[PDB]
Every structure is written in structure tokens, then in C-alpha cells.
């Protein structure tokens, strides 16, 4: 939970600094400063490691060819006045703007489609960082975009400490070292800047350790299918 | 006027927040140090070093 992370930061890592309040808990006024750094740390960990991969269904409309990955066009977000909401969200999968990289794209039946392929004029291109361009949209089709997902963003004004930070206990130290590095690096004092650099190096060492141990089952080899494809 | 004797308890009360003159001067210097430190301008180590 966020309370545990705040206590851990207050005593042990952010101890000899103002934000830690001498190990008596993070002040209720410095929340929008640890939370901003925490969002960056969670984004870094969720982009460098595959801690959350999710899929989103994009319903194709006859007059729309550029589909934006924004919650304003979501089926569950009822606050938006968009006439056509092509994102197909469910109470289970909500699509809270947590998109880090669009990896794979499928169709309604389940056949993979090419992504960003120029020679094949049947591929789904990506114009901008959050858009999906379908040159050939059909009113009776739906996409099945799968992406690497981010942690649901914790608002800067969040006050409830029961908001759960969903990271494995192995990356707790990596996140904490990242937060310490980011908070220690703001000041231009050489002595404090050196500590910030040391925290950055230690965070990059923890990440290297987790990569070397593959605690998230990311770098796992697959069955070779090249002989079958080449006709052996 | 009534003059009072100068005793040991008028310089140091042997407490950090003492009522002596040295204790009050320490509290006053610590007030400026805390004012600067509340703006993330100095680390705890530098706070104690100064």
C-alpha cells in the first residue's frame, strides 16, 4: 500500500533530507512531490520490464480511420461527450491511458496483423504516439490491440493512503532507489548531487540484477519454428 | 533596580531547549537553519555540520 511505501521512504532512504521529516513520516504537504516521482519510477519499471501487458478492443467505424488511444473514446468512460466511443472497455479491463508500447495487433477472429509495415498494404500503421491508423476500416470489424501497460497513474492530489502500489517485492528496492535518486538530484549541491548519482547507479544495478535473474520471466527463449517455415 | 547573581543556570540549562543565554542562541541559530532546511536547500548531514 501507499502508506507502507511512504513509511519506508520516510525512515531508511529519505532520512537525511527534508522530505523525510527526520523519519517521522512524509508530511501531508509533500505528497504531491513523492507521488510525482513515484509515477515516474513506476513508469520506468513498467516500460523497462513487462510488469503489466493488457489488450484493448477498438471497434471500427465506417467514417473513422485514425483511432486515438485516449480514455475520452472509451465505452466505460461516461463523462465524455464523444459521439463515437470506439474503445471497448469493460469493468475488468478499463484502459486508464496506461499505454507504454503498442506491441501486437490482431483482428476480431484472432489472426495477427502487421504493425508499421510499409510494403504490405494491409498493415496497421501508427502515425503518432497514441494513434492507430486503419486505412481500410469496416463498420462490422473490431481490433484487438495488445500493449505493454503502465501502472494506473496516482493523482498528485491523492490523499487516501490505501491506494495499492502493485509492484513485486523484488522491485520495491528498485523503485525506492529511483525515488531517492530523483529527489536527491534536484539540488545543485555537489555533495548532494554525488549522492543522487550514487542512487542512480544503485538503481541501475538493481535493474541489472533483476534482468540477470529474470524475476519477471521476460527473457525466456521460445521453441524454434524456422525449420518448419523454411520447409525442412 | 534589583540585580540578580550570575549563576551557571543563566548560561546553560544543560538542555537543548534550555532557558540560558547559550541555549537561546542555539535555538535562534537553529531557527534560521530550520527555515533554510524546510526549503530542501541543505541535507541533514550539512544541517548537523553547520
Q: Which residues of B touch A19 (CB under 8 A)?
A: 40
For strands A142-149 and A53-59, give the pairing. antiparallel
Q: How far is CA B38 from the centre of its chain?
A: 17
What's the number of CA atoms in the CB half-sphere (13 Å) around residue B13? 12
Q: Which residues of B touch A187 (CB under 8 A)?
A: 40-41
The DSSP-derived string for A12-27 is: IIS-SSGGGGGGT---
CA distance A215 to A171: 9
Q: Which residues contact A137 (CB under 8 A, 6 or more apart)?
A: A60, A61, A62, A64, A65
Residues present in chain B in total: 50
Q: Which residues of B touch A192 (CB under 8 A)?
A: 43
CB A87 within 8 A of CB A74: yes
Q: Residue A220 is placed in which grid cell?
A: 525466456
Q: Which residues contact A132 (CB under 8 A, 6 or more apart)?
A: A58, A66, A67, A68, A69, A102, A105, A124, A126, A143, A145
The answer for A29, left when phi > 0, alpha when psi is -120 to 50, beta otherwise, is: alpha
The DSSP-derived string for A62-109 is: TT--EEE--GGGBSS-TT---S---EE--SS----S-EEEEEEEE-SS
CB contact under 8 A, A17 and B38: no
Q: Which residues of A touch B34 (CB under 8 A)?
A: none
Instruction: Please name the member of B38, B40, B45 whose beta carbon is closest to the beta carbon of A187.
Output: B40
Instruction: Please name the member of A18, A189, A195 whose beta carbon is closest to the beta carbon of B38.
Output: A18
B33: number of Cβ within 10 Å: 15
Distance from CA of A41 to the nearest CA of B (A): 21
CB contact under 8 A, A191 and B46: yes
Q: Residue written as cell 513498467?
A: A46
Burial class (CB in 10 A: 0-12, 13-18, 19+), A119: exposed
CA distance B33 to B29: 6
Return the number of CB contacts < 8 Å for A and B. 24
Burial class (CB in 10 A: 0-12, 13-18, 19+), A64: middle
CA distance A39 to A29: 17
CB A143 within 8 A of CB A132: yes
Q: Residue written as cell 539540488?
A: A187
CB A150 within 8 A of CB A52: yes
Amino acid at each position: 500500500k501507499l502508506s507502507e511505501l511512504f513509511q519506508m521512504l520516510s525512515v531508511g532512504e529519505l532520512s537525511l533530507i527534508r522530505t523525510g521529516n527526520d523519519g517521522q513520516g512524509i508530511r501531508t504537504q509533500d505528497y504531491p512531490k513523492v507521488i510525482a516521482q513515484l509515477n515516474a519510477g513506476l513508469t520506468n519499471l513498467h516500460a523497462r520490464f513487462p510488469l503489466l501487458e493488457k489488450e484493448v478492443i477498438i471497434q471500427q467505424y465506417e467514417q473513422i480511420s485514425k483511432y486515438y488511444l485516449r480514455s475520452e473514446f472509451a465505452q466505460m468512460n461516461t463523462t465524455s461527450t464523444e459521439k463515437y466511443k470506439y474503445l471497448m472497455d469493460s469493468p475488468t479491463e478499463r484502459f486508464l491511458d496506461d499505454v507504454i508500447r503498442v506491441e501486437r495487433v490482431f483482428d476480431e477472429c484472432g489472426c495477427p496483423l502487421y504493425l508499421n509495415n510499409e510494403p504490405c498494404c494491409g498493415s496497421i500503421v501508427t502515425p503518432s504516439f497514441d494513434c492507430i491508423q486503419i486505412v481500410y476500416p469496416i463498420e462490422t470489424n473490431a481490433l484487438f490491440v495488445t500493449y505493454r501497460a503502465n501502472h494506473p497513474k496516482i493523482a498528485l492530489t491523492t490523499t487516501d493512503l490505501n491506494t495499492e502500489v502493485r509492484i513485486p517485492a523484488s522491485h520495491e528496492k528498485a523503485l525506492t532507489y529511483y525515488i531517492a535518486s530523483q529527489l536527491y538530484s534536484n539540488s545543485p549541491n555537489p555533495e548532494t548531487a554525488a549522492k543522487g548519482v550514487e542512487w542512480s547507479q544503485r538503481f541501475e544495478a538493481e535493474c541489472t540484477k533483476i534482468e540477470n535473474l529474470d524475476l519477471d520471466n521476460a527473457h525466456i527463449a521460445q521453441t524454434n519454428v524456422k525449420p518448419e517455415m523454411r520447409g525442412w | 533596580v534589583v540585580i540578580e547573581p550570575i549563576t551557571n543556570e543563566d548560561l546553560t540549562t544543560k538542555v537543548v531547549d534550555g532557558t540560558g543565554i547559550f541555549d537561546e542562541l542555539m535555538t535562534a541559530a537553529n531557527a534560521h537553519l530550520s527555515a533554510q532546511w524546510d526549503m530542501e536547500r541543505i541535507t541533514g548531514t550539512q544541517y548537523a555540520e553547520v
